[PDB]
Amino acid sequence: SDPPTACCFSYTARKLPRNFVVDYYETSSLCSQPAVVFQTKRSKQVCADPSESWVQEYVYDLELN
Amino acid sequence: SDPPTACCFSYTARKLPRNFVVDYYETSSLCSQPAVVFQTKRSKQVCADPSESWVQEYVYDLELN
Amino acid sequence: GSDPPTACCFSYTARKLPRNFVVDYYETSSLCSQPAVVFQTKRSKQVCADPSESWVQEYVYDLELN
Amino acid sequence: GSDPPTACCFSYTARKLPRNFVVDYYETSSLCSQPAVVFQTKRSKQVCADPSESWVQEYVYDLELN
Amino acid sequence: GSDPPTACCFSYTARKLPRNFVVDYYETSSLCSQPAVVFQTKRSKQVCADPSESWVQEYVYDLELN
Amino acid sequence: GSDPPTACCFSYTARKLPRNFVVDYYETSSLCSQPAVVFQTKRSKQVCADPSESWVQEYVYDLELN
Amino acid sequence: SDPPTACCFSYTARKLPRNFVVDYYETSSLCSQPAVVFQTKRSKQVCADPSESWVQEYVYDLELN
Amino acid sequence: SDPPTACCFSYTARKLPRNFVVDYYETSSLCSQPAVVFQTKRSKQVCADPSESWVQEYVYDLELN
Amino acid sequence: GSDPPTACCFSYTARKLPRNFVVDYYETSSLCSQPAVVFQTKRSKQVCADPSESWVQEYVYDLELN
Amino acid sequence: GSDPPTACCFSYTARKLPRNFVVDYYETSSLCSQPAVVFQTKRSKQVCADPSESWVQEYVYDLELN
């Protein structure tokens, strides 16, 4: 259809514990800046800065393993 | 927390029948364009151009009544 | 999702879908070349339909209100 | 089906995907307004990629003959 | 969601909450002047807590995992 | 009242609210990084507004006096 | 906004009958001493010493039940 | 009885419009710092710094006139 | 209020107050030399009473629960 | 009344009142644990003042003979 798109205008400042995270997605390229959104065990959603080591590590891990 | 913000880059082109709509909200000023998001009875979410009048009409009705 | 593809209809069904086959529907994006209802069945079959048809709209109404 | 929706890309990804995320590709229908490669990740995600881009071309080539 | 206000803690509770008073939590936006955990009580109250305390991170884990 | 979180606005609505959407307001704590007026709508929503705008101070007066 | 904070400098000396109490709250950590404030059926407000046990008892009961 | 006492730990930063204010009181001397609390037309309550000109002016005025 | 005086009882009434005279009651501050119920009548008469008396406590209960 | 509550001061004001706020005074009962002057403002507010303080003494004197 024509749903709204998820964008991030601010990033969490805290590294999340690995086992708090159960999934991720990357925000559209239409958004004004790049971002990763992590889904948690309690199903919360968290904007996270893709420039940071820990974010990439979790992304690599959720994708590959 | 630091969750995603809903943003509309593309708007629906049809006019929604009034009775398909149960709720609405308006996208953050941080988005690159103004938008109204309508919620339908099937719990779907549709971007809508706030410059269209039926959009304004339904918004006043949902707010006031 | 990120930058996934959009669903678009380039033809409309010519045969009416049995109403009880259909469990859901969506409208295709306005980015598409033409408007279209996509009907969804229980076995997850996807059927493009002409929005200007009367049974299409009748189905859409039943799905949305009932 | 008899008249299924077609996958089309209108917006591309601005990111170069990690090659090791990508396990497959496919090209969008000629019926689409524009040509696109859609990459498919290990996780079954779908990423529209702009065929004009060199990484996109290189990725396809590598998938095909490797 | 439009432009509603953000929850920020400028002070932390100095008392420790009995674990069975708590039923949920969240952390404050990075936009705030300091980090904080906000617990939600059975009676539906909201309590700013210092994230550097042991009980605070214990509760958060327990809430998040179990 | 114990140690609940403080409401702070980090961004202001860019739209002007129809006067008859609004039914109450408050101003944010001086503890916040910037000043702000938060309006409460008929549908009970909360909207951060820029205190330096004309309509914002008009509404506030009207709400406060009449 | 920027309203006053409730603080207890003197505590009540009697034990409130349970059924006089309808609600409670706990004074901000900014105050100079810990306190529980009980609300009565006549909507009065009574500081109470959190170190006293009937105080704790009633608090658990109001929260849990 | 033994009610809680109103204390202020932070002061408004905005000078209130005179006709928003309908009353004042001064906070107990038991509180950790001196303060004035203004009551408004809508019956809100506002901690205000007594060191400031505008506060004293309103205090003088509500007292004398 | 600011630093207003406290109400304290230094004697207790020796005559029982007609129950229907009484519309409200309060307990005197613990800062006082002795405990006391202060009963309030319709014409705003203030009457100190011994908390250990049975009619005093009976009145207090009726006022608080009914 | 037959046994009315007595006004007593346990805490004093740390502020020197503006002389022009004060329209009257009275002294608390000898039954009180401590001696106090209670000032009465234009607005009928009541302020316990510490008789040890010079401004308090001066205020009383001025009220009495002026």
Side-chain angles (χ1 to χ4, degrees), chain D residues 33-54:
Chain D
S33 65
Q34 64 172 169
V37 168
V38 166
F39 289 116
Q40 317 182 261
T41 68
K42 211 134 180 304
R43 272 173 128 10
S44 333
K45 281 165 166 77
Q46 304 260 119
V47 189
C48 294
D50 172 338
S52 316
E53 280 162 346
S54 69

Side-chain angles (χ1 to χ4, degrees), chain G residues 4-65:
Chain G
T5 313
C7 284
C8 289
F9 304 95
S10 137
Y11 306 108
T12 196
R14 76 254 194 202
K15 163 172 169 171
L16 286 167
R18 177 59 180 74
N19 269 323
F20 280 15
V21 181
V22 303
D23 214 329
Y24 87 94
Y25 68 82
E26 236 152 311
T27 61
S28 157
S29 73
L30 304 175
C31 297
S32 57
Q33 58 177 168
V36 178
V37 180
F38 293 110
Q39 179 182 305
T40 70
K41 302 244 171 111
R42 298 221 337 304
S43 261
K44 298 291 143 56
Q45 302 241 118
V46 190
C47 299
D49 188 337
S51 64
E52 273 162 58
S53 56
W54 72 269
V55 170
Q56 248 213 215
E57 298 307 337
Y58 287 7
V59 159
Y60 285 65
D61 193 73
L62 288 169
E63 258 306 300
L64 303 190
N65 312 303

Side-chain angles (χ1 to χ4, degrees), chain F:
Chain F
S2 53
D3 318 271
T6 302
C8 291
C9 298
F10 300 105
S11 73
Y12 306 122
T13 192
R15 268 168 268 192
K16 163 181 179 176
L17 298 164
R19 175 64 182 85
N20 59 340
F21 278 33
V22 181
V23 301
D24 205 356
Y25 81 100
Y26 63 76
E27 305 229 19
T28 49
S29 170
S30 62
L31 292 168
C32 305
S33 60
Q34 64 175 178
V37 164
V38 185
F39 292 107
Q40 311 173 204
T41 70
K42 184 108 173 5
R43 220 159 159 90
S44 210
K45 305 153 138 101
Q46 312 239 110
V47 190
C48 292
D50 189 341
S52 297
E53 304 210 39
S54 151
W55 72 270
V56 183
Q57 295 310 318
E58 179 195 351
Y59 287 25
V60 166
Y61 276 78
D62 188 63
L63 282 168
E64 187 64 44
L65 301 194
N66 335 324

Side-chain angles (χ1 to χ4, degrees), chain E residues 13-25 38-45 47-49 53-56 58-60 62-63, chain F residues 2, chain G residues 24 26 36 50 53 55-65:
Chain E
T13 192
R15 268 168 268 192
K16 163 181 179 176
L17 298 164
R19 175 64 182 85
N20 59 340
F21 278 33
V22 181
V23 301
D24 205 356
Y25 81 100
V38 185
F39 292 107
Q40 311 173 204
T41 70
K42 184 108 173 5
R43 220 159 159 90
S44 210
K45 305 153 138 101
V47 190
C48 292
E53 304 210 39
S54 151
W55 72 270
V56 183
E58 179 195 351
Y59 287 25
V60 166
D62 188 63
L63 282 168
Chain F
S2 53
Chain G
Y24 87 94
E26 236 152 311
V36 178
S53 56
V55 170
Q56 248 213 215
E57 298 307 337
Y58 287 7
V59 159
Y60 285 65
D61 193 73
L62 288 169
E63 258 306 300
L64 303 190
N65 312 303

Side-chain angles (χ1 to χ4, degrees), chain D residues 8-37:
Chain D
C8 300
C9 296
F10 297 109
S11 97
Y12 302 118
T13 195
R15 338 263 215 263
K16 187 177 153 162
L17 280 170
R19 173 67 186 84
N20 50 310
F21 286 12
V22 175
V23 301
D24 217 349
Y25 77 104
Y26 77 76
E27 238 157 87
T28 45
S29 166
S30 48
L31 303 165
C32 294
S33 65
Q34 64 172 169
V37 168

Side-chain angles (χ1 to χ4, degrees), chain J residues 10-63:
Chain J
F10 297 109
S11 97
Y12 302 118
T13 195
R15 338 263 215 263
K16 187 177 153 162
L17 280 170
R19 173 67 186 84
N20 50 310
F21 286 12
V22 175
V23 301
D24 217 349
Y25 77 104
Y26 77 76
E27 238 157 87
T28 45
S29 166
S30 48
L31 303 165
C32 294
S33 65
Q34 64 172 169
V37 168
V38 166
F39 289 116
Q40 317 182 261
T41 68
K42 211 134 180 304
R43 272 173 128 10
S44 333
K45 281 165 166 77
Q46 304 260 119
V47 189
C48 294
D50 172 338
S52 316
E53 280 162 346
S54 69
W55 76 269
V56 177
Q57 316 196 9
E58 291 159 8
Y59 276 28
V60 171
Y61 277 63
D62 185 86
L63 280 158

